[PDB]
Design a binder for this molecule. Structure first.
Ligand SMILES: C=C(O[C@@H]1C=C(C(=O)O)C=C[C@H]1O)C(=O)O
Ligand SMILES: [Fe+3]
Ligand SMILES: [Fe+3]
Length: 368
């Protein structure tokens, strides 16, 4: 796969893109309102795209964790569908520098300060994050990491996004933020985690301890209760189970609550994805408060990490997944990302190891 190509693998719509008609940097802030400069500029661009010959134009790309920042969206010249089933079956690296940002002690102290703050009224939850920055001696073939990534994660939402800087956004996300498929939309937030065990009894047991974990379930209800409210104002039918179910990835168990709703007349994939994003799985609760902690404590900027990646078409359909279990590569440099939701029951070392298991997915892709 050419690094200049968008790739999206999903049980819903799996396709690749070719070419580039128009890039779209407009920040997705206030993208939930149709009157917003984002939504207006988006319609004018689709219209311009049809006017200039592009059949069924589609918007693909990525939106950062903070949508006041520029977006990484673009309309390709064409797009190509493929079978996810079929793809599920048909699928050196010298190191020069390695650094954790931040390292173990600083991260545990970050969790500890945040878990202290969440014990207070002003904040109930915070998602802290860390990275691993890796330099290599050569240019990275993003096309081959992708084939490795799908093999190791044949079931998740796997994406490969060309970026305006010659880099790629690559990842196997398990969190669907917003699918729109007609007037009906779905959303399956995740929150709470447990390492899978190599034995199927330790595994099943690990999954049960998760469903019984009070810490990991408080971490979860905080997320679903926030979205239940946001979507109550904008839906007509809305089904939210009072409790979560379990799902899996090759490394982790997670807790999931599937959302199902019907959308008003003038919604689209993006108005709704910009509505929910970022959820308390990625920013925290309340949103601004947790965002102030993240800024007070994180010694980097997430940029595209913790954002959303996916696609929206001319007719309102689309899918958007959380930008996690992912990496930004560019020429000879790599940056991985893992965050974790802190609550008063959070263990400083517990979270360090949890963000660690999450990095293991992209590390498994780079054979590290
Ligand atoms: C934001 C991240 O993951 C989130 C963190 C999880 C948790 O431990 O509660 C569950 C859902 C994930 O979407 C990440 O991996 O960086
Ligand atoms: Fe967690
Ligand atoms: Fe119904």
């Amino acid at each position: 796969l050419a690094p200049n190509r968008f790739f999206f693998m999903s049980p819903y719509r799996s396709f690749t893109t070719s070419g580039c008609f128009a890039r779209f940097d407009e920040p997705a802030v206030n993208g939930d309102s149709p009157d917003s400069p984002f939504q207006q500029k988006l319609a004018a661009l689709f219209a311009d795209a049809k006017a200039q010959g592009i059949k069924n134009p589609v918007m693909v790309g990525a939106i950062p964790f903070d949508p006041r920042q520029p977006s990484s969206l673009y309309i390709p010249e064409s797009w190509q569908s493929f079978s996810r089933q079929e793809k599920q079956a048909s699928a050196s690296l010298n190191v020069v520098e390695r650094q954790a940002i931040p390292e173990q002690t600083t991260f545990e102290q970050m969790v500890a300060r945040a878990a202290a703050l969440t014990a207070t009224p002003q904040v109930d939850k915070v998602v802290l994050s860390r990275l691993i920055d890796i330099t290599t001696d050569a240019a990275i073939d993003s096309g081959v990491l992708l084939e490795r990534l799908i093999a190791q994660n044949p079931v998740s939402y796997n994406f490969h996004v060309p970026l305006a800087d010659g880099g790629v956004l690559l990842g196997a996300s398990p969190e669907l933020l917003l699918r729109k498929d007609g007037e009906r939309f779905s959303s399956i937030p995740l929150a709470g985690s447990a390492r899978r065990q190599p034995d199927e009894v330790l595994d099943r047991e690990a999954g049960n301890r998760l469903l019984a974990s009070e810490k990991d379930r408080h971490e979860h209800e905080l997320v679903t209760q926030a979205m239940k409210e946001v979507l109550r104002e904008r839906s007509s039918e809305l089904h939210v189970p009072s409790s979560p179910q379990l799902i899996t990835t090759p490394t982790l168990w997670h807790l999931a609550t599937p959302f199902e709703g019907k959308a008003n007349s003038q919604e689209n994939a993006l108005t709704l994805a910009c509505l929910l994003h970022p959820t308390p799985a990625l920013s925290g609760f309340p949103h601004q408060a947790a965002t102030q902690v993240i800024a007070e404590l994180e010694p980097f900027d997430r940029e595209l990490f913790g954002g959303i990646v996916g696609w929206c078409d001319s007719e309102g359909n689309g899918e958007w997944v959380v930008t996690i279990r992912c990496a930004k590569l560019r020429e000879n440099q790599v940056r991985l990302f893992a965050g974790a939701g802190i609550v008063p029951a959070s263990s400083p070392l517990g979270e360090w190891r949890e963000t660690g298991v999450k990095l293991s997915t992209m590390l498994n892709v780079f054979g590290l």
